[PDB]
Design an enzyme around this catalytic site. Sequence first.
Site, PDB file in Angstrom:
ATOM      1  CG  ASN A   1      -8.143   6.874  -5.394  1.00 19.62           C
ATOM      2  OD1 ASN A   1      -7.279   6.126  -5.862  1.00 19.62           O
ATOM      3  ND2 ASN A   1      -8.385   6.955  -4.085  1.00 19.62           N
TER       4      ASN A   1
ATOM      5  CG  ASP B   1      -6.503   5.353  -1.331  1.00 20.89           C
ATOM      6  OD1 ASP B   1      -7.629   5.194  -0.809  1.00 20.89           O
ATOM      7  OD2 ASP B   1      -6.219   4.965  -2.477  1.00 20.89           O
TER       8      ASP B   1
ATOM      9  CG  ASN C   1     -11.232   5.926  -0.093  1.00 22.98           C
ATOM     10  OD1 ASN C   1     -12.400   6.279   0.003  1.00 22.98           O
ATOM     11  ND2 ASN C   1     -10.482   6.204  -1.154  1.00 22.98           N
TER      12      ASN C   1
ATOM     13  CD  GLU D   1      -3.072  -0.703  -0.052  1.00 23.02           C
ATOM     14  OE1 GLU D   1      -3.133   0.418  -0.589  1.00 23.02           O
ATOM     15  OE2 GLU D   1      -3.775  -1.656  -0.451  1.00 23.02           O
TER      16      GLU D   1
ATOM     17  CG  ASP E   1     -13.393   7.425  -6.148  1.00 21.65           C
ATOM     18  OD1 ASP E   1     -12.454   8.131  -5.759  1.00 21.65           O
ATOM     19  OD2 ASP E   1     -13.538   6.254  -5.772  1.00 21.65           O
TER      20      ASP E   1
ATOM     21  CB  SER F   1     -11.991   9.145  -2.537  1.00 17.19           C
ATOM     22  OG  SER F   1     -11.458   8.015  -3.216  1.00 17.19           O
TER      23      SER F   1
END
Length: 130
Positions: A46, A53, A60, A35, A49, A51
């Site tokens: 991202n 991380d 998220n 990750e 959408d 959002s």
Amino acid sequence: KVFERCELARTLKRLGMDGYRGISLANWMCLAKWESGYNTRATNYNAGDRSTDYGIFQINSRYWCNDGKTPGAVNAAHLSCSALLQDNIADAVAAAKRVVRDPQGVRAWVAWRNRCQNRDVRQYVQGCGV
């Protein structure tokens, strides 16, 4: 901060992650590795959408932490996403525990399925004394 492998393993053990909801420490290590590469300040937008991380576990902003700029957002862990960018990972750990309390479990992270699931993950904690 960028953790060293064994340093992180011991830290997660002390924070009660070993076996949390059936998830071994080696599995949490495999997840953190893929990750963020054990980097607490890792962030990833991202574009698709809107959002983001955040942190070592790439949590998220749509469901787990609040950053104010994510449309259709909710706060399940109820944290500020800022807390997930600290050197001290206590809050990131509390958030990760919350994520896996949903039926999806560790499978919530697609990267876990691709690079950890059904694999030999012993290499992540080998020689660390955990």
